[PDB]
Amino acid sequence: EMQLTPFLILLRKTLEQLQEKDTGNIFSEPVPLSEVPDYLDHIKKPMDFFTMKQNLEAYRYLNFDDFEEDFNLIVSNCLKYNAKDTIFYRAAVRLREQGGAVLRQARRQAEKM
Numbered sequence: 001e002m003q004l005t006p007f008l009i010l011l012r013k014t015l016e017q018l019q020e021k022d023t024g025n026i027f028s029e030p031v032p033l034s035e036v037p038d039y040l041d042h043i044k045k046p047m048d049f050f051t052m053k054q055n056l057e058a059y060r061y062l063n064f065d066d067f068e069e070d071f072n073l074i075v076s077n078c079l080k081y082n083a084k085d086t087i088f089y090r091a092a093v094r095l096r097e098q099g100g101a102v103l104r105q106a107r108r109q110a111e112k113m
């Protein structure tokens, strides 16, 4: 129960804050199926920050939980696909950790609305 415009402004800011934690920009765009041809065999719902931005502007995030769930998919897809001894896997762990405080603070701002 709140106004749409300030909520979307908050989500845009939050998405930027999350992307700032991905310094190598490895989560910025869809995993390229031309370089990773078997990716969809194991990952049923790919996600990345560009797709999240598209979803945001298409009004697909009208609650904080749905936004946070797509962020969690970026992380969990990467943990699932990649071996534990890779930079990718460790980057997903780090993103999960650093994203946590970002999301907790942003959710508090949504609740304030």
Ligand SMILES: CCn1c(=O)c(=O)[nH]c2cc(C(=O)N[C@H](c3cccc(F)c3)c3nccn3C)ccc21
Residues within 6 Å of the ligand: 026, 027, 031, 032, 035, 036, 077, 078, 081, 082, 088
């Ligand atoms: C973390 C999400 N992620 C995975 O989780 C995963 O398993 N494989 C991934 C593979 C790529 C990937 O191929 N990057 C290349 C690349 C290499 C160097 C710079 C640059 F900008 C892009 C590339 N893109 C298109 C063509 N080329 C070669 C990206 C993410 C991936």
